[PDB]
Amino acid sequence: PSLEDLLFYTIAEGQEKIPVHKFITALKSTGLRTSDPRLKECMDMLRLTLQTTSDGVMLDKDLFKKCVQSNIVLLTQAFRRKFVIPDFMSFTSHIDELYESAKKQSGGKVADYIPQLAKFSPDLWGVSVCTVDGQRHSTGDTKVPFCLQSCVKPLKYAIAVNDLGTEYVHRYVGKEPSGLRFNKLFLNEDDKPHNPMVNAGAIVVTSLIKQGVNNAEKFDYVMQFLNKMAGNEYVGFSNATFQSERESGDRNFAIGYYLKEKKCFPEGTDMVGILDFYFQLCSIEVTCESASVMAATLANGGFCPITGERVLSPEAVRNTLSLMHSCGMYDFSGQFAFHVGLPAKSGVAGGILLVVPNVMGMMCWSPPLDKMGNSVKGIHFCHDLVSLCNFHNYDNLRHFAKKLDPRREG
Amino acid sequence: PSLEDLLFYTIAEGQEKIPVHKFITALKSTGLRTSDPRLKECMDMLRLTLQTTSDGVMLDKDLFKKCVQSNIVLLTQAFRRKFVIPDFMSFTSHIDELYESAKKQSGGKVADYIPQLAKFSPDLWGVSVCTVDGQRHSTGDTKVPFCLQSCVKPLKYAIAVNDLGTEYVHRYVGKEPSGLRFNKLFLNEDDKPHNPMVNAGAIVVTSLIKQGVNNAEKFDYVMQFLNKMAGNEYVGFSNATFQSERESGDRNFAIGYYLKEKKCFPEGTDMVGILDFYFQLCSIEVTCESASVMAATLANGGFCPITGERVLSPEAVRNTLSLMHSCGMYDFSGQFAFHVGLPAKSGVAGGILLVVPNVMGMMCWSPPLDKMGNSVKGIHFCHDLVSLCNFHNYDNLRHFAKKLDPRREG
Amino acid sequence: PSLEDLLFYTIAEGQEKIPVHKFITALKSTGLRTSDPRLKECMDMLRLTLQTTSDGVMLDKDLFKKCVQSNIVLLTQAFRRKFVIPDFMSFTSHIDELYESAKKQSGGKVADYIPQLAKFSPDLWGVSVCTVDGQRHSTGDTKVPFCLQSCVKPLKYAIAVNDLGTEYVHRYVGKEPSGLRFNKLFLNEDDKPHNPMVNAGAIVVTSLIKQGVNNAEKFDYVMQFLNKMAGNEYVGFSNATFQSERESGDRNFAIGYYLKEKKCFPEGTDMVGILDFYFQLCSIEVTCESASVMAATLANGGFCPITGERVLSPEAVRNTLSLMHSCGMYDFSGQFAFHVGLPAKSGVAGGILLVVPNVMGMMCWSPPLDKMGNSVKGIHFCHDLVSLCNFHNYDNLRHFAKKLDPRREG
Amino acid sequence: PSLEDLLFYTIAEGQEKIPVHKFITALKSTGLRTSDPRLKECMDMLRLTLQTTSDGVMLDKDLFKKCVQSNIVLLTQAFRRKFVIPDFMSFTSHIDELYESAKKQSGGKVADYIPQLAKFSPDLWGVSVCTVDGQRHSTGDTKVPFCLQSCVKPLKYAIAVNDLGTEYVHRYVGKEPSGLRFNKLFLNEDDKPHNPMVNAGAIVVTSLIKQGVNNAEKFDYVMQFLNKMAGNEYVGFSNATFQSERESGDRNFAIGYYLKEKKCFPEGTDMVGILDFYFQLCSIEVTCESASVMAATLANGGFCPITGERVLSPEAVRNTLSLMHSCGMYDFSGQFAFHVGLPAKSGVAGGILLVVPNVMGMMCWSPPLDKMGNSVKGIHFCHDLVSLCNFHNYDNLRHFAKKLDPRREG
Ligand SMILES: O=C(Cc1ccccc1)Nc1nnc(N[C@@H]2CCN(c3nnc(NC(=O)Cc4ccccc4)s3)C2)s1
Ligand SMILES: O=C(Cc1ccccc1)Nc1nnc(N[C@@H]2CCN(c3nnc(NC(=O)Cc4ccccc4)s3)C2)s1
């Protein structure tokens, strides 16, 4: 009694033959996209079958077997409800409601210190989800590209820890929040930036990645790596944002000279070059969708959930998630950790990279920022989400009052 | 047939009768203690039956059932390996190795600013575990009473949030680490103490509890509360420590007057009484074992694992777990959060209250402190614990390298 | 058949009955003594059986069985050559050659040092062997009482590590030898005595044992511990040696005051009293034979060989053997470790307590000392022993030139 | 019956023929490598058989006999579980766990001295095992070449004693640790370096080897010797490390001139030349794997375990193990001897040559050293190994508490 034929009877309902669209609809209903890279062989085979059998279109036990066999393990887990969120449909309806609520939150100011962010409508609002099992949902403007900006800080920190290890990286950068009123100070008392999520800390992390090669390869190396975290969905680049960011980055240069003088960099660092590399990494583009997959890779201990590819070490991902928890939301970091209790990173373009460990990754995007620099609708959404679901780090998985748990059912 | 007989033959193993000792030994190996409050009916019925047949002492099926039917759901759960740590006997052997490794860390200094702590041996060292299912383990000096000191701070903060709610409580006290810099200041910029885990914060929290009634009743109420938390295991009081603490609390009187002048207290507070109540709370005694149960209540969403009682609202436990993560280990809070990733609270007696959410609570106790004020062996044990098991809060449950996961049979 | 009968036939050579004396002669030849504590039940039963009849005395199978059934495991082991040295009769013959050869080393000088050792005569010379299986051999003056003097140092250090543990004991004393040039300093750079085998170290170890009771109770307690170690063989006390020790004790008082000033003792120490306790411990009396048992308890992982009792924890015995290796023979410790490769401890009375781990314990005793303070004859014998047998710690058990291995048969 | 046959039925299980892969799998599970030089005849015959029969490929009892006849003794020992560590599979699993435990110890600093050992990273960590029976296991970075450095000191001292005797060699060098730890001084009071494991002792030992010929012959001579100890596994040379060591050896030139002036060399010694030879010997290269075989030769009384060849005299190997005990780990020598109780030698590349007498040889390697100059990870591993197994010199083989003994089974 193979997997293939016993799953066959599940969708077969008791009939001899299965509608192709009935299979596809059932597949989608689990939250998997038909374009999922782990489902390619099966999708090619279904397409091929539609060609070679216009006499249909319905799958015999043996025909069904011939399509789904190469992707059979995934298809089972999907259809035997063993995914991290069993009732993904119900969950996405909740996501949509959360979305509609934050959509009514119209305040905040779009960043305008360079013309490439002043341009973005205040009304763009997008939310994407990717579970650690690759289940997907999106609502709103989730295919509009925007710059990562500071959302890239944890990503490049993760690359650094991955390539070099914790101990080395943290010779150069600390692992703690500054404390909300040592905002302005570049260095902690050990003459290290206090953590990798502040600009000074990010600038030093940037200086550690791929030492020795030029910025072109350095950038290519980081771009490859983001491609994998995103399961090869959209990772772009804004040159316009880069040119603007470098021509108006006085404080970043102020930080650059300070760090150099305090000898914060590895020997042989070309600081002005590192600053230029730093502006490039800030100008790297995503959509909500592709970024949600990056977040999911961090939710999934370093494996990209839609390719099954190991992208980062567990050590790299844990460190990163630790610091997004405590340092990722600027001056709202403590507030956020307290009330939302999720690892997250915001950016000046309006992105909030969000991780729900062992469940899912998200990217919420809306350009208007609050006084602290976080997307208004993103922050509102994040609070609501943890109000609804027992996703708070220190929520309990067995005793959680009236909170809903999307990891269960009846 | 039914649960009791189903269970009966499991322990029975083909033969007709079960010896009582063979049932008791079977039960212990699940990690439940025979004195478990939820197993009282069963043990009462065993004592009656061991009175009935000095003739015995076997148990046939209907007699076995007579003993266990009242506690059958718990006993089945225990015996069919449904507990949070299925192979607990393997897990305690790991705890024992961890224990012996920290035992070799003989450095640090016993607090001597008051004589009651000076007298404690630098060689006392105990660790106690209580899982969210009531499984128990201890190694070392675990029934020796010692004062909570600052380990009580999250307990009384939990009580305050439980009785009054988050929002009211945090009108008087903040929700963020000061961090590690700065760390002499009594108030943040909103003129609130930074958080509940610092002295200034604890003092203010102490003032919110059971307002209106006198300090004798307040202490009573908190004792009863700590009783529920410990599942009625050992909670006491060191009057000697109380006297020492109060004739040596210049700094907390300095804090008290500062807070009073800044109007940090609720209207109608007698600040000097509150400072007397706070010193009392610090002088409350526990053992490793009874404190590990309190920690398990926090691990278990507010339900005391060995009684089944709801002690704290889930709100209270979350808030508390949040602030123990970022603020619970003094100047080592950030390092500890980064490296151990567990909510914890230390005290100057050498206690470390440790919570592994959804898994277990622990108390570690060894009087010698490091220069930050944390128990040396406790700190070493805690690091090792998380080097071994995937208990770090930002460990992945599915992809965790070569860490051990005690929640699985692998 | 059964083991008693199997054993019977062995000792009965097909003959119908075993004479008692024949069984006794057969038993002695294994190396066991008839007075062996583990063989009491059997000897009690041979005494009773030899009372049943004026003469007799034969034992048929059921009578033999009657006497030997209580101790059959040990008797079988002895008779089927399972003892650590199978051909023990051959071995004692080579102990005797070694003895006679050292007997011709008449050089050296008795400690005139105190009024009690000056009368002890340079012709006395005895060597006793006790293996880890209780096999015994003696040659020369082995029942003559003499004081342990510094041979007591590993014994009292073992007691301390046994009662208090390694980490406590070594807060007070070190675990290395100093310079052969710094054999005059009392303290190392951490202001602890160098190790337990020097006077300053021994004095500090003496202060650790049974704190809180008077020194007459402390002395009793060490004597009790020393009784277990010798399997209740001779342990005494020389008041004479004690008096001359305490008057000629200027350097110990010098060390005493130096340790006091440098705060080397446990809090609440009466240094002057400790010196007096110390003088008593050095004046404790043994014979060659009883001391060899003490040495064999150390050879046997802390179990006394002729009684089976767990006398010392493995930690105690290992710690003790390690420090006898490097620190046990004064200025000759280095040369002795290199050439003899056995843990040993000498004393000014002429004694050398010798441990061959996993094989045997020995006491060698001969009052004339060389210019380093070690018994001339003892040192000569220890050299010859390791020249003859592959007992050196860094001899190879498989490839050992033309050395003899007593652990192996033909 | 013939051994070949008796062994045949073992693996035959009950069948008439043995599948070749099944014999190979059974062989390797003993820990023997198929590439073992003692198994060459058998492996050649098996390879030949696989050629001369495209059939099977299964061994008749007659065919099997033809393959394994010439190596029958060793194959018997291997299959009848008579190797020093019977359950090698279980042991290697324990090696791996110790490995993973030391792997999380990322402190220490790579030996920066004249930047080019700095070329390979602080992340390299490998452990290789070779038993005295030739059983092999490796984990981590064990085929990366690194320079012996000071790890070569015991090897060239063993060569010297082998060729010259103990008496000659120790006219020129001492037998003792410099004591507590002055290796400020080059000479002891007899104007001899203290022992062969200090640089002045190593330099003087170097001057002893192969006197009369030039340095290339001397070097070839020691290299062929190293080839035998390693069973002809990798022994190389780093010219890079040599030129470097040669231009950075002021201290060694300071020692060289001191020794010359104090007449420490043999008559006719060209000191500056000897220093150059000395630099070359430090620059000799091994892997973890080949070095483990060297250590195993020392563990096996001077016979290389994987060739059965006599490389060093028992006197040479004993002398070397005695001095590795007390003088092998720099300043940690006393502490290491106490806590680990194994002969070991560290080098500044991060290697630790470790001998467990009569059991196995090991090489641990991790470049980051501690303040004393010993590999952080190696030291951690060595401590953990002796905590786990009863391999400490002065562990007892019969009574050893909770330690595991891998020389045993049930
Ligand atoms: O803040 C204000 C006034 C203000 C108030 C309200 C609104 C607008 C302006 N002015 C500033 N001047 N300079 C600043 N930062 C420079 C650059 C980085 N830094 C250090 N980084 N690390 C250092 N080393 C340390 O140890 C930490 C430290 C510094 C000061 C006090 C305590 C600790 S200095 C020194 S900010
Ligand atoms: O100010 C705010 C609001 C705020 C917060 C953040 C940013 C802007 C405004 N709240 C508070 N002010 N003062 C407080 N505590 C009392 C008074 C000062 N103190 C000392 N702390 N430390 C003292 N001694 C020293 O700072 C040298 C020293 C340094 C190193 C080693 C030894 C001494 S006095 C004890 S709470």
CSV table of N, CA and C in Angstrom, one decimal, chain B residues 292-377:
chain,number,residue,atom,x,y,z
B,292,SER,N,11.8,25.3,42.5
B,292,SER,CA,11.7,24.7,41.2
B,292,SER,C,10.2,24.5,40.7
B,293,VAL,N,9.3,24.3,41.7
B,293,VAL,CA,7.9,24.2,41.4
B,293,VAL,C,7.3,25.5,41.0
B,294,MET,N,7.7,26.6,41.8
B,294,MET,CA,7.3,27.9,41.5
B,294,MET,C,7.7,28.3,40.1
B,295,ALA,N,8.9,28.0,39.7
B,295,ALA,CA,9.4,28.1,38.4
B,295,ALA,C,8.6,27.3,37.3
B,296,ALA,N,8.2,26.1,37.7
B,296,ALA,CA,7.4,25.3,36.8
B,296,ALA,C,6.0,25.9,36.6
B,297,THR,N,5.4,26.6,37.6
B,297,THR,CA,4.2,27.2,37.4
B,297,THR,C,4.3,28.3,36.4
B,298,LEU,N,5.4,29.0,36.4
B,298,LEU,CA,5.7,30.0,35.4
B,298,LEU,C,6.0,29.4,34.0
B,299,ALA,N,6.6,28.2,34.0
B,299,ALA,CA,6.9,27.5,32.8
B,299,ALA,C,5.5,26.9,32.2
B,300,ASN,N,4.6,26.7,33.1
B,300,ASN,CA,3.3,26.1,32.7
B,300,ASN,C,2.1,27.1,32.5
B,301,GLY,N,2.4,28.3,32.1
B,301,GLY,CA,1.3,29.3,31.9
B,301,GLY,C,0.5,29.7,33.1
B,302,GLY,N,1.0,29.5,34.3
B,302,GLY,CA,0.3,29.9,35.5
B,302,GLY,C,-0.4,28.8,36.3
B,303,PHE,N,-0.4,27.6,35.8
B,303,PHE,CA,-0.9,26.4,36.4
B,303,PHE,C,0.2,25.7,37.2
B,304,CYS,N,0.0,25.4,38.5
B,304,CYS,CA,1.0,24.7,39.2
B,304,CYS,C,0.9,23.2,38.8
B,305,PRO,N,2.1,22.8,38.3
B,305,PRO,CA,2.2,21.4,37.7
B,305,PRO,C,1.8,20.3,38.6
B,306,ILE,N,2.1,20.4,39.9
B,306,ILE,CA,1.8,19.3,40.8
B,306,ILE,C,0.5,19.3,41.6
B,307,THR,N,-0.3,20.3,41.3
B,307,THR,CA,-1.6,20.4,41.9
B,307,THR,C,-2.7,20.6,40.8
B,308,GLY,N,-2.4,21.1,39.7
B,308,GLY,CA,-3.3,21.4,38.7
B,308,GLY,C,-4.0,22.8,38.8
B,309,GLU,N,-3.7,23.5,39.9
B,309,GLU,CA,-4.3,24.7,40.2
B,309,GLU,C,-3.8,25.9,39.3
B,310,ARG,N,-4.8,26.7,38.9
B,310,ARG,CA,-4.5,28.0,38.3
B,310,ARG,C,-4.0,28.9,39.3
B,311,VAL,N,-2.8,29.4,39.3
B,311,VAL,CA,-2.3,30.3,40.3
B,311,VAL,C,-2.1,31.7,39.8
B,312,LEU,N,-1.6,31.8,38.5
B,312,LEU,CA,-1.4,33.1,37.9
B,312,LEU,C,-2.2,33.2,36.6
B,313,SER,N,-2.7,34.4,36.3
B,313,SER,CA,-3.2,34.6,35.0
B,313,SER,C,-2.1,34.5,33.9
B,314,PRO,N,-2.4,34.1,32.7
B,314,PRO,CA,-1.4,33.9,31.6
B,314,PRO,C,-0.7,35.3,31.3
B,315,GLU,N,-1.4,36.4,31.4
B,315,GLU,CA,-0.9,37.7,31.3
B,315,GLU,C,0.3,37.9,32.3
B,316,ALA,N,0.0,37.6,33.5
B,316,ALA,CA,1.0,37.7,34.6
B,316,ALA,C,2.3,36.9,34.3
B,317,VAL,N,2.2,35.7,33.7
B,317,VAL,CA,3.3,34.8,33.6
B,317,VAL,C,4.1,35.2,32.4
B,318,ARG,N,3.4,35.6,31.3
B,318,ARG,CA,4.1,36.2,30.1
B,318,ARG,C,4.9,37.4,30.4
B,319,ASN,N,4.3,38.4,31.0
B,319,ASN,CA,4.9,39.6,31.4
B,319,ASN,C,6.2,39.3,32.3
B,320,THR,N,6.0,38.5,33.2
B,320,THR,CA,7.1,38.1,34.1
B,320,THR,C,8.2,37.4,33.4
B,321,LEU,N,7.8,36.4,32.5
B,321,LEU,CA,8.8,35.7,31.7
B,321,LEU,C,9.6,36.7,30.8
B,322,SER,N,8.8,37.6,30.2
B,322,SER,CA,9.5,38.6,29.4
B,322,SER,C,10.6,39.4,30.1
B,323,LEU,N,10.3,39.9,31.3
B,323,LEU,CA,11.2,40.8,32.0
B,323,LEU,C,12.3,40.0,32.7
B,324,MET,N,12.1,38.7,32.9
B,324,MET,CA,13.1,37.8,33.4
B,324,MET,C,14.1,37.5,32.3
B,325,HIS,N,13.7,37.5,31.1
B,325,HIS,CA,14.5,37.3,29.9
B,325,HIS,C,15.6,38.5,29.8
B,326,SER,N,15.0,39.7,29.8
B,326,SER,CA,15.9,40.9,29.5
B,326,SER,C,16.5,41.5,30.8
B,327,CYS,N,15.9,41.3,32.0
B,327,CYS,CA,16.3,42.0,33.1
B,327,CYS,C,16.7,41.2,34.4
B,328,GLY,N,16.8,39.9,34.3
B,328,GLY,CA,16.8,39.1,35.5
B,328,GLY,C,18.1,38.7,36.1
B,329,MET,N,19.2,39.0,35.4
B,329,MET,CA,20.5,38.6,35.8
B,329,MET,C,21.5,39.7,36.0
B,330,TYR,N,21.0,40.9,36.4
B,330,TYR,CA,21.7,42.1,36.6
B,330,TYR,C,22.5,42.5,35.4
B,331,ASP,N,23.7,42.9,35.6
B,331,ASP,CA,24.5,43.4,34.4
B,331,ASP,C,24.8,42.2,33.5
B,332,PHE,N,24.5,41.0,33.8
B,332,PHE,CA,24.7,39.9,32.9
B,332,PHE,C,23.5,39.5,32.2
B,333,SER,N,22.4,40.3,32.3
B,333,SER,CA,21.2,40.1,31.7
B,333,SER,C,21.3,39.9,30.1
B,334,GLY,N,22.0,40.8,29.5
B,334,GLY,CA,22.2,40.8,28.1
B,334,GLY,C,23.0,39.6,27.5
B,335,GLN,N,24.1,39.3,28.2
B,335,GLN,CA,24.9,38.1,27.9
B,335,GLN,C,24.1,36.9,28.1
B,336,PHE,N,23.3,36.8,29.1
B,336,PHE,CA,22.6,35.6,29.5
B,336,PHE,C,21.5,35.4,28.5
B,337,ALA,N,20.8,36.4,28.2
B,337,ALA,CA,19.7,36.4,27.2
B,337,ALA,C,20.3,35.9,25.8
B,338,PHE,N,21.4,36.5,25.4
B,338,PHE,CA,22.1,36.1,24.2
B,338,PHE,C,22.5,34.6,24.3
B,339,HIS,N,23.1,34.2,25.3
B,339,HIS,CA,23.8,32.9,25.3
B,339,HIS,C,22.8,31.8,25.8
B,340,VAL,N,22.0,32.0,26.8
B,340,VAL,CA,21.2,31.0,27.4
B,340,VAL,C,19.9,31.0,26.9
B,341,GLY,N,19.3,32.2,26.7
B,341,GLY,CA,18.1,32.4,26.0
B,341,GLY,C,17.0,31.8,26.9
B,342,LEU,N,17.1,32.0,28.2
B,342,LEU,CA,16.1,31.5,29.1
B,342,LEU,C,15.7,32.6,30.1
B,343,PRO,N,14.4,32.7,30.4
B,343,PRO,CA,14.0,33.6,31.5
B,343,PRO,C,14.6,33.2,32.8
B,344,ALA,N,15.2,34.0,33.5
B,344,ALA,CA,15.9,33.6,34.8
B,344,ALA,C,16.0,34.8,35.8
B,345,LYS,N,16.1,34.4,37.0
B,345,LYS,CA,16.3,35.5,38.0
B,345,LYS,C,17.2,35.0,39.1
B,346,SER,N,18.2,35.8,39.4
B,346,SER,CA,19.2,35.5,40.4
B,346,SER,C,19.0,36.3,41.6
B,347,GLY,N,19.6,35.8,42.7
B,347,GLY,CA,19.5,36.5,44.0
B,347,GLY,C,20.8,36.3,44.7
B,348,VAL,N,21.0,37.2,45.7
B,348,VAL,CA,22.3,37.3,46.3
B,348,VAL,C,22.7,36.1,47.3
B,349,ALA,N,21.6,35.3,47.6
B,349,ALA,CA,21.9,34.0,48.3
B,349,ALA,C,22.5,33.0,47.4
B,350,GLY,N,22.4,33.1,46.1
B,350,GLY,CA,23.0,32.2,45.2
B,350,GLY,C,22.0,31.4,44.4
B,351,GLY,N,20.7,31.8,44.6
B,351,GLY,CA,19.6,31.2,43.8
B,351,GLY,C,19.5,31.7,42.4
B,352,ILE,N,19.2,30.8,41.5
B,352,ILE,CA,18.8,31.2,40.2
B,352,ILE,C,17.5,30.4,39.9
B,353,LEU,N,16.4,31.2,39.8
B,353,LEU,CA,15.2,30.7,39.4
B,353,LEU,C,15.2,30.6,37.8
B,354,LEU,N,15.0,29.4,37.3
B,354,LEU,CA,15.1,29.3,35.8
B,354,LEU,C,13.8,28.7,35.2
B,355,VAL,N,13.4,29.3,34.1
B,355,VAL,CA,12.2,28.8,33.4
B,355,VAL,C,12.5,28.4,32.0
B,356,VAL,N,12.2,27.1,31.7
B,356,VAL,CA,12.2,26.7,30.3
B,356,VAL,C,10.8,26.6,29.9
B,357,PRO,N,10.2,27.6,29.2
B,357,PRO,CA,8.8,27.7,29.0
B,357,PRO,C,8.3,26.4,28.2
B,358,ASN,N,7.1,26.0,28.7
B,358,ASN,CA,6.4,24.8,28.1
B,358,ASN,C,7.2,23.5,28.4
B,359,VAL,N,8.2,23.5,29.2
B,359,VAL,CA,9.0,22.3,29.5
B,359,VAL,C,9.2,22.1,31.0
B,360,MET,N,9.9,23.0,31.6
B,360,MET,CA,10.2,22.8,33.0
B,360,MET,C,10.6,24.1,33.7
B,361,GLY,N,10.6,24.0,35.0
B,361,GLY,CA,11.1,25.1,35.9
B,361,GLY,C,12.3,24.5,36.6
B,362,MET,N,13.2,25.3,37.0
B,362,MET,CA,14.3,24.9,37.9
B,362,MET,C,14.7,25.9,38.9
B,363,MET,N,15.3,25.4,39.9
B,363,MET,CA,16.0,26.3,40.8
B,363,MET,C,17.4,25.7,41.0
B,364,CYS,N,18.4,26.6,40.8
B,364,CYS,CA,19.8,26.3,41.1
B,364,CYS,C,20.2,27.1,42.3
B,365,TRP,N,21.0,26.5,43.1
B,365,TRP,CA,21.5,27.2,44.3
B,365,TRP,C,22.9,26.9,44.7
B,366,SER,N,23.8,27.9,44.7
B,366,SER,CA,25.2,27.8,45.2
B,366,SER,C,25.6,29.2,45.6
B,367,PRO,N,25.9,29.4,46.9
B,367,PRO,CA,26.1,30.7,47.5
B,367,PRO,C,27.2,31.5,46.9
B,368,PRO,N,28.3,30.9,46.4
B,368,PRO,CA,29.3,31.9,45.8
B,368,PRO,C,28.9,32.6,44.5
B,369,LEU,N,29.0,33.9,44.5
B,369,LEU,CA,28.6,34.7,43.4
B,369,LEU,C,29.7,35.2,42.6
B,370,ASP,N,29.5,35.5,41.3
B,370,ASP,CA,30.6,36.2,40.5
B,370,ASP,C,30.5,37.7,40.8
B,371,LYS,N,31.3,38.4,40.1
B,371,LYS,CA,31.4,39.9,40.4
B,371,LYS,C,30.2,40.6,39.9
B,372,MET,N,29.3,40.0,39.2
B,372,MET,CA,28.1,40.6,38.8
B,372,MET,C,26.9,40.3,39.8
B,373,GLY,N,27.2,39.3,40.7
B,373,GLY,CA,26.2,39.0,41.7
B,373,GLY,C,25.4,37.7,41.4
B,374,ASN,N,25.8,37.0,40.4
B,374,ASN,CA,25.2,35.7,40.1
B,374,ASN,C,26.0,34.5,40.6
B,375,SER,N,25.2,33.5,40.9
B,375,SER,CA,25.9,32.3,41.4
B,375,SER,C,26.8,31.7,40.3
B,376,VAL,N,28.0,31.3,40.7
B,376,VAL,CA,29.0,30.9,39.7
B,376,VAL,C,28.6,29.6,39.0
B,377,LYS,N,28.3,28.6,39.9
B,377,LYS,CA,27.9,27.3,39.4
B,377,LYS,C,26.6,27.3,38.7
